[PDB]
């Protein structure tokens with residue numbers, strides 16, 4: 001299970017992962033549908049040096065099959081997250097090698113929006129919505145009070161999370177609503193949020209700017 005990690009919008013470089021055989025006739029690249037059905041996308045003849053791309057609109061003007069059978073896909077999309085197979089064909093044999101492609105799109109810097117004009121003591125109020133957009137894969141939202149993680153607590157800290165996918169791009173938008181019961185200790189205290197996600201270089205976290213609220217009490 002060899003994997004190629006690519007950032008959204010970059011060129012995906014997929015080497016064949018096969019030794020060049022003696023008596024090579026041609027090579028072909030294909031991708032597998034979710035249930036394993038094959039779709040051929042590129043062809044290269046070793047004898048004629050010709051290059052042909054199958055009529056697959058999803059890959060129109062996006063492929064380049066080099067002389068050593070490396071397939072390059074331009075402008076990485078979420079639909080490119082598939083298993084690709086390099087097939088080398090000789091006069092009496094077929095050799096196949098798969099490569100898993102994973103695509104990553106960095107979530108937007110989170111922002112606290114739809115903010116309360118003021119928080120009320122002994123009353124649960126919607127502090128705001130922490131939104132992080134156009135991400136792939138989805139991310140986890142954490143809330144903080146004075147730079148310290150704010151965990152849920154019955155009748156005091158209620159966190160309502162949702163992840164929505166755009167059906168055309170397959171990118172995620174994460175929204176975390178914080179319903180909060182303030183105290184006078186929150187006078188001039190900053191509230192922030194962050195998004196934790198997996199990218200090509202591993203697990204990363206991006207923090208938001210702070211939000212300070214006027215605390216009202218009877």
Ligand SMILES: *[C@@H]1O[C@H](CO)[C@@H](O)[C@H](O)[C@H]1NC(C)=O
Nearest residue numbers: 013015016066067068069070
């Ligand atoms: C040879 O393969 C490498 C990847 O292993 C690729 O970067 C290079 O462009 C290829 N060269 C040719 C001439 O196909």
Ligand SMILES: *[C@@H]1O[C@H](CO)[C@@H](O)[C@H](O)[C@H]1NC(C)=O
Nearest residue numbers: 138139140196197198203204
């Ligand atoms: C998000 O949280 C879940 C647990 O709820 C965890 O399994 C997952 O690895 C977390 N994702 C990231 C990007 O850390």
